[PDB]
């Protein structure tokens, strides 16, 4: 099936029947245990939501394409409140060239190591067969309300042999998601007075995509396959007024409807695959080079994450990420039947960011050990990793899987991530699964870097009103999490009923600090001798909830599917505030009718529970008025169909959000001077939207 405890498959056929506008987050987020959330609780860049597994935040969600990491978002400045002005890393592969998506949550994902603390999303592409095939896929949606941005998408694939031992596969995508109108949130905004009167919290940023991938497979012997692939992708946005704090200036307005960030992503990969008697082998080299070109922003207080009109123009941040991986897999025959996997991994992240490191110390006064001007643009970390998984058959139908991962991070030091995964047949229809693993999170190159320096005159300083600096800290420990999960599943004649409890005990979550470690010397007026905070390790945090799935065959042609997320707890145990903001629950419900041999029909309902904002502001003081606002439970219904015209041509058509339930970003979560908070009202939910699709394939 598509749902075991801790794991979900999305198939090409699923993607086809619930087409995404553009980004895959749309369909990935409907898996149990998965939300579409910001990383922390500020609501900053709140229309830029990314995949979150079990409320661990999206920085703890590792995105792979065919087993190879995507790290491109690590090229976007990481801000004071743990958000990047990034659309995430699930929009690099076009929907219609995906074979399947694998989502691995909690203890079963730790084995993947750095940044799999929430879990892994592996986006798997269609490959060549024994013959040549190819496809041409087009999708086009049509919002009821014009304010909301429509999406258009055209991709092709082409795959097959060249020789007896030479296979290839190529695809290309062109797509565009129009931005929401600059004024979509007008009349819904938080109360804005004085200087900030007239300001608006923005709708969804638009994106233009260009994706080209080529792969050559070379199986130069019976037991030896060698793969070369290159990826060229380009996302340029369509700006619609978004700023960190929802303030505006003149440069912002000048740029409405213009490209203000472009990401170029280049991937080259060498992969050798072995199969012989003793067992299996895999090793790969990926070089990911990301260029993040965007308009200079300020790094101080209310000027953090607005276009800086004193330093107008684009800079380019450059991420060179290098990944090499080796695994062999061994069948073994002993007192217990088993399979042993042995592996090394090596990664290098070089970040050149010529803008992030430029906050100067004149106003707050200077910081011993930090040069106020011409600090290095450069950050880097290498992790070396060794691991062995043992997949032990005790008695047929029962598997015990212990694995040890050891990682050497060249700054933070040594990590030991042990794991144990049990699956037990209690019956031929019932399976119990238990798992406890310690997953691993390396500090990001922003958190780690003593040259990375933000400033506030007070409004963003914890436990005071005075000026303060926030500073990078190479003294940081890595974040570790003991992800526990206990689950049970009945599966028989496509009847599936399962429920999982998960608890992740979260140690040394990295976060803007609560106590000054120091005070600077000198600078201007009341702002002089500002307090110094660094990126700190929070001792303890907890997430806890329930994943459920229930699939009933109503009739032979008719299938009723349901996935449930219920979030019990999400607590920073130091401040007692929430980590993420997620709906209390999420129920996704599909009815799938095979109405003919040729016609298939789909009704879907998604129910979102209550959403509560953070209780405390940047000061650590309790928020008041509209900063407390919660979002009521709501549902989104949709109908669709796919009418097969020939083995060569299929048409799709449907309506997302049938009953036109809409939500509007009112701003960030808390109040600032002149800008009331918006609590949980931090994102735009789009209204009724018609769509059509056409897929031609040999
Ligand atoms: Fe300020």
Swiss-Prot record:
Q: Where is this region: Disordered?
A: 34-54, 187-206, 349-376
Q: What is its main location?
A: membrane
Gene3D superfamilies in alphabetical order: TonB-dependent receptor, beta-barrel domain, TonB-dependent receptor, plug domain
| Induction per the UniProt record | By iron and enterobactin.
Can you give the residue ranges of the TBDR beta-barrel domain? 131-698
Q: Which Pfam family, just one, is annotated for this protein? A: Plug
List the NCBIfam families hit by this protein, alphabetically: PRK13524.1, PRK13528.1, TonB-siderophor
Q: What is this protein called?
A: Ferric enterobactin receptor
The major lineage groups are:
Bacteria, Pseudomonadati, Pseudomonadota, Gammaproteobacteria, Pseudomonadales
């Amino acid at each position: 099936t598509k749902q075991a405890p801790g794991v979900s498959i999305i198939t090409a056929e699923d993607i086809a029947k619930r087409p995404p506008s553009n980004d895959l987050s749309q369909i990935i987020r409907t898996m149990p245990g998965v939300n579409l959330t910001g990383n922390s609780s500020s609501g900053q860049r709140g229309n830029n939501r990314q995949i979150d597994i079990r409320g661990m935040g999206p920085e703890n969600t590792l995105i792979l394409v065919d087993g190879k990491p995507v790290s491109s978002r690590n090229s976007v400045r990481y801000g004071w409140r743990g958000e990047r002005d990034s659309r995430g890393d699930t929009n690099w592969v076009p929907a219609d060239q995906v074979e399947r998506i694998e989502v691995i949550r909690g203890p079963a994902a730790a084995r993947y190591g750095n940044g799999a603390a929430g879990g892994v999303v592996n986006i798997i592409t269609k490959q060549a067969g024994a013959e040549t095939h190819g496809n041409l896929s087009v999708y086009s949606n049509f919002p009821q309300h014009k304010a909301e941005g429509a999406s258009e998408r055209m991709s092709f694939g082409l795959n097959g042999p060249l020789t007896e031992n030479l296979s290839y596969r190529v695809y290309g995508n062109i797509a565009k998601t129009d931005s929401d109108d600059w004024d979509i949130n007008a009349g819904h905004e938080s109360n804005r007075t004085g200087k900030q009167a007239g300001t608006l919290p923005a709708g969804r940023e638009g994106v233009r995509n260009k994706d080209i991938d080529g792969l050559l497979s070379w199986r130069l012997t019976p037991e030896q396959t060698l793969e070369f692939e290159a990826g060229f992708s380009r996302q340029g946005n369509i700006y619609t007024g978004d700023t960190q704090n929802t303030n505006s200036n003149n440069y912002v307005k000048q740029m409405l409807g213009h490209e203000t960030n472009r990401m170029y992503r280049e991937t080259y990969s060498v992969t050798h695959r072995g199969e012989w008697d003793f067992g299996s082998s895999l090793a790969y080299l990926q070089y990911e080079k990301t260029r993040n070109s965007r308009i200079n922003e300020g790094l101080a207080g209310g000027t953090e994450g607005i276009f800086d009109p004193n330093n107008a123009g684009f800079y380019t941040a450059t991420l060179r990420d290098l990944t090499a991986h080796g695994e062999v897999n061994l069948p073994l025959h002993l007192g217990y039947e088993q399979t042993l996997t042995l592996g090394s991994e090596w990664t290098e992240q070089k970040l050149d960011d010529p803008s992030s490191n430029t906050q100067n110390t004149e106003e707050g006064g200077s910081i011993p050990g930090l040069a106020g001007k011409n600090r290095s643009s450069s950050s880097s970390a290498r992790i070396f990793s060794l691991f062995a998984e043992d997949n032990i058959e005790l008695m047929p139908g029962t598997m015990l899987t212990p694995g040890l991962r050891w990682d050497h991070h060249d700054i933070v030091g040594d990590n030991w991530s042990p794991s144990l995964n049990l699956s037990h047949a209690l019956t031929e229809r019932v399976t119990l699964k238990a798992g406890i693993a310690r997953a691993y999170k390396a500090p990001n190159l922003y958190q780690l870097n003593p040259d990375y320096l933000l400033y506030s005159r007070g409004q963003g300083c914890y436990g005071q009103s005075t000026s303060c600096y926030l500073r990078g800290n190479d003294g940081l420990k890595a974040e570790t999490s003991v992800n526990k999960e206990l689950g049970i599943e009945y599966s028989h004649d496509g009847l599936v009923a399962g429920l999982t409890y998960f608890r992740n005990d979260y140690k040394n979550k990295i976060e803007s600090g609560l106590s000054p470690v120091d005070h600077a010397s000198g600078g201007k007026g009341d702002y002089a001798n500002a307090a110094i905070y660094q990126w700190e390790n929070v001792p303890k945090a907890v997430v806890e909830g329930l994943e459920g799935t229930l699939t009933l065959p109503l009739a032979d042609g008719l299938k009723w599917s349901n996935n449930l997320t219920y979030m019990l707890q999400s607590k920073n145990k130091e401040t007692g505030d929430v980590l993420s903001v997620t709906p209390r629950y999420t129920l996704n419900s599909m009815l799938d009718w095979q109405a003919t041999d040729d016609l298939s029909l789909q009704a879907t309902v998604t129910w979102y529970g209550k959403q509560k904002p953070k209780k405390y502001d940047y000061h650590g003081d309790r928020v008041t008025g509209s900063a407390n606002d919660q979002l009521s439970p709501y549902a989104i219904a949709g109908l669709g169909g796919t009418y097969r015209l020939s083995k060569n041509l299929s048409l799709g058509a449907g309506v997302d959000n049938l009953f036109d339930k809409r939500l509007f970003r009112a701003g960030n979560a808390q109040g600032v001077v002149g800008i009331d908070g918006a609590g949980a009202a931090t994102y735009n939910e789009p209204g009724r939207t018609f769509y059509t699709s056409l897929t031609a394939s040999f």
